[PDB]
Amino acid sequence: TYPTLHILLQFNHRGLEARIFRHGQLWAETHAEVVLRSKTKQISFLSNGSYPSMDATTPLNPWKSTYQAVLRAEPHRVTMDVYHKRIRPFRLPLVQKEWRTCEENVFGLYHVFETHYAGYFSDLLIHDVETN
């Protein structure tokens, strides 16, 4: 097996929304209080796992900025590649991260993601899945 998670990330004026997919099924959701309008600050947060100063929530000047994180648990490493909008063949990842660790399952693979963004995401709301 290879555990894989696809995480759709939306930055908006309300914060950062993570939707976690598993074989194309929405498996889990979480939210973070990460309010960042510019692409530069968003990608800096995505790379570093944190950002020092958040922007103001402005419901009259809203925004929507979307990224996709792809996590793979290869036999002797975990990788995370983050793509603008979604993984496509014409575009390359904005952020590349790698860890010398073995993960058994999607729950461990999510823990790696959550630990890179430590302190930000609330606990998972999880949904019924019908695998394959």
Numbering used by the authors: 10 to 141
Give excerpts from the publication.
The PRF-stimulatory activity of 2A is related to its ability to bind to the RNA stimulatory element. Here we show that 2A adopts an RNA-binding fold, allowing specific recognition and stabilisation of the PRF stimulatory element in the viral RNA and direct binding to host ribosomes.
Here we present the crystal structure of 2A from encephalomyocarditis virus (EMCV), revealing a novel RNA-binding fold that we term a “beta-shell”. We crystallised the protein and determined the structure by multiple-wavelength anomalous dispersion (MAD) analysis of a selenomethionyl derivative. Unexpectedly, the four molecules are arranged as a pair of covalent ‘dimers’ with an intermolecular disulfide bond forming between surface-exposed cysteine residues (C111). 2A adopts a compact, globular fold of the form β3αβ3αβ. The concave face of the beta sheet is supported by tight packing against the two alpha helices: together, this comprises the hydrophobic core of the fold. In contrast, the solvent-exposed convex face and surrounding loops are enriched with arginine, lysine and histidine residues, conferring a strong positive electrostatic surface potential at physiological pH. In addition to the N- and C- termini, the β2-loop-β3 region (residues 28–37) exists in multiple conformations that deviate by up to 5.8 Å in the position of the Cα backbone.
